[PDB]
Amino acid sequence: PLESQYQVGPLLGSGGFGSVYSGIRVSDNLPVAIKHVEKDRISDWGELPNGTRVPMEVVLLKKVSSGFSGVIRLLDWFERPDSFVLILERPEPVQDLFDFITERGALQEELARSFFWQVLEAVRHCHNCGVLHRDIKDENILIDLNRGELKLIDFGSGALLKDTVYTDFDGTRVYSPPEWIRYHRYHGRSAAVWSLGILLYDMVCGDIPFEHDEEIIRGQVFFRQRVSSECQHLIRWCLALRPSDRPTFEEIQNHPWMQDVLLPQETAEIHLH
Numbered sequence: 001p002l003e004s005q006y007q008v009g010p011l012l013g014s015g016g017f018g019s020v021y022s023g024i025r026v027s028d029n030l031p032v033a034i035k036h037v038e039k040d041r042i043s044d045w046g047e048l049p050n051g052t053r054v055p056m057e058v059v060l061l062k063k064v065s066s067g068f069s070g071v072i073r074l075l076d077w078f079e080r081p082d083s084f085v086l087i088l089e090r091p092e093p094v095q096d097l098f099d100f101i102t103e104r105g106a107l108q109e110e111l112a113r114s115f116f117w118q119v120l121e122a123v124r125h126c127h128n129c130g131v132l133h134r135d136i137k138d139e140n141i142l143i144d145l146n147r148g149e150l151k152l153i154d155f156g157s158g159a160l161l162k163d164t165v166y167t168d169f170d171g172t173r174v175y176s177p178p179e180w181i182r183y184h185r186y187h188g189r190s191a192a193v194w195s196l197g198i199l200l201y202d203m204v205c206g207d208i209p210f211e212h213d214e215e216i217i218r219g220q221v222f223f224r225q226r227v228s229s230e231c232q233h234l235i236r237w238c239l240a241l242r243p244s245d246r247p248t249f250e251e252i253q254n255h256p257w258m259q260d261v262l263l264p265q266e267t268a269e270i271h272l273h
């Protein structure tokens with residue numbers, strides 16, 4: 001019975017992903033997040049190592065949950081008649097990147113550098129564990145306001161990482177690559193890099209670069225804020241129209257703009273405290 005193991009708090013939010021509540025594990029008072037997703041709303045299903053029907057999200061989460069905490073870890077999960085309930089780690093105090101950007105405006109490049117680097121590390125961790133997130137965006141990353149550490153959330157649109165083409169997509173369209181818009185086909189890593197380009201622009205400009213399909217397809221970036229030439233270059237590289245023209249993750253992290261990143265703690269002391 002999960003109803004007695006957890007003290008349910010306020011609704012943190014709801015949307016396509018379902019409904020997520022703040023919670024507290026009664027045994028040790030550990031802060032937690034409680035996510036409800038209706039079975040009717042789940043189209044992507046997977047198999048547990050012990051042979052059982054579970055949402056793919058659970059499968060993916062299990063594969064990425066462990067030491068490296070760039071990703072919010074799954075602590076436990078329950079099946080109900082018409083829904084699944086996930087119990088997830090919850091940092092405190094916390095704010096998602098979307099709200100942070102909204103309230104603070106465009107981020108100083110030193111801050112964006114640290115945040116972007118942490119996201120890259122988190123995404124690399126996922127890929128190394130055979131998991132593709134498919135919905136990297138500011139709304140899906142949490143900021144531990146005390147430690148300056150970022151955490152990736154919501155694998156409800158994710159999939160197992162593969163080297164062949166994806167022909168399905170239920171992520172955020174304005175973060176999706178031109179090859180999806182045009183051909184309904186994309187490969188995991190190169191598509192991820194595109195979304196990262198969108199994210200980086202978002203960090204240093206205060207808003208997303210594209211709104212309509214035609215803009216994504218044209219792939220022309222204009223800067224509304226003062227942004228260094230190095231940063232502009234990295235962004236334009238990630239947003240290359242041709243997937244094969246985009247940088248690998250190693251290439252991104254070796255880019256000149258990516259050098260001399262602050263540690264999470266230093267980042268918090270300077271920018272969050």
Ligand SMILES: N[C@H]1CCC[C@H](Nc2cccc(-c3n[nH]c4cnc(-c5cccnc5)cc34)n2)C1
Binds near residue numbers: 035072088095098154
């Ligand atoms: N864009 C917003 C929409 C509302 C959910 C979320 N906000 C917060 C706020 C504090 C903690 C967590 C939190 N702590 N731990 C978590 C684990 N998973 C999720 C989550 C969010 C969305 C979809 N799936 C899972 C959220 C959390 N999430 C992000």
